[PDB]
Structure 1
Amino acid sequence: EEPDREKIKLLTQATSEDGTSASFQIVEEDHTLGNALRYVIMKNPDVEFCGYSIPHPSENLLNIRIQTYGETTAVDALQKGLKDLMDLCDVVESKFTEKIKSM
């Protein structure tokens, strides 16, 4: 049994005890996913604040901060934005497969 505990690190110094406002810290990520994830998280009707931020160009880090209104924590809203980004990549893959099979 071996998970990976460096890839995502919730920063408790800026995380509300309510859970509805947290600041995550990914390693080895940048504008690639952090702008794709910020887009899909902001489509949740319960999200009040979302933004990604790279602290310095040197280290490969990524901070995204979700604040919700209520009845959904930011950890609960981080993972809805990861499934809908997983579901969106399957739509694009299912359309780009048809059109290659349409030539």
Structure 2
Amino acid sequence: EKIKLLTQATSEDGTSASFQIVEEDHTLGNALRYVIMKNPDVEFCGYSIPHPSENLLNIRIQTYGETTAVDALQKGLKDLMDLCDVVESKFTEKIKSM
């Protein structure tokens, strides 16, 4: 129950969906939103905090077809991981020099 699909927003086709994540803020949400907005198949992506006092985050993902919103979320998570990995590799390489 870390991340949940909101059935009041998901479509029977599967292209449009809303995900609610517990214990998140504008830290994972902003990065994930940008990284998945890099996806050419994604039409609409956004993140919203219902209330600041609750550790709940929402991501809305709607595609152009040919790809579900869950697949878009997976691609965004993998791309964010790879982005962090390359910044880690660059930092480690630069530490050795100076």
Mark yes or no: TM-score above 0.5.
Answer: yes
Q: What SS does structure 1 have at the residue aligned with 2:97?
A: coil
Q: What SS does structure 2 have at the residue aligned with 1:101?
A: helix
Aligned length: 98
Q: Distance in 2 between the 1:99 and 1:89 partners?
A: 15
Q: Distance in 2 between the 1:36 and 1:101 partners?
A: 28
Task: Say if 2:86 is the partner of 1:86.
Answer: no
Q: What is the match of residue 54 of structure 2?
A: 59
Q: Distance in 1 between the 2:22 and 2:83 partners?
A: 23
Q: What SS does structure 2 have at the residue aligned with 1:9?
A: strand
Q: Distance in 1 between the 2:7 and 2:19 partners?
A: 9
Please report how far the alpha carbon of residue 68 of structure 1 lies from its aligned counterpart in structure 2 after TM superposition: 0.1
Please report how far the alpha carbon of residue 100 of structure 1 lies from its aligned counterpart in structure 2 after TM superposition: 0.7
Q: CA RMSD in A?
A: 0.4
Please report how far the alpha carbon of residue 46 of structure 1 lies from its aligned counterpart in structure 2 after TM superposition: 0.4
Please report how far the alpha carbon of residue 43 of structure 1 lies from its aligned counterpart in structure 2 after TM superposition: 0.6
Tell me the alpha carbon deviations over residues 19-70 of structure 1, each in whole angstroms, 9 at most, x when there is no partner.
0000000000010000000000001000000000000011100000000000
Please report how far the alpha carbon of residue 90 of structure 1 lies from its aligned counterpart in structure 2 after TM superposition: 0.5
Q: What is the match of residue 31 of structure 1?
A: 26
Runs of 4+ residues deviating >6 angstroms:
none
Q: Distance in 2 between the 1:95 and 1:82 partners?
A: 20
Normalising by the residue count of structure 2, what TM-score does the alignment of the two structures yield? 0.99
Please report how far the alpha carbon of residue 93 of structure 1 lies from its aligned counterpart in structure 2 after TM superposition: 0.3
Q: Distance in 2 between the 1:26 and 1:55 partners?
A: 11
Please report how far the alpha carbon of residue 99 of structure 1 lies from its aligned counterpart in structure 2 after TM superposition: 0.8
Q: Distance in 1 between the 2:51 and 2:17 partners?
A: 20
Tell me the alpha carbon deviations over residues 59-82 of structure 1, each in whole angstroms, 9 at most, x when there is no partner.
100000000000000001000000
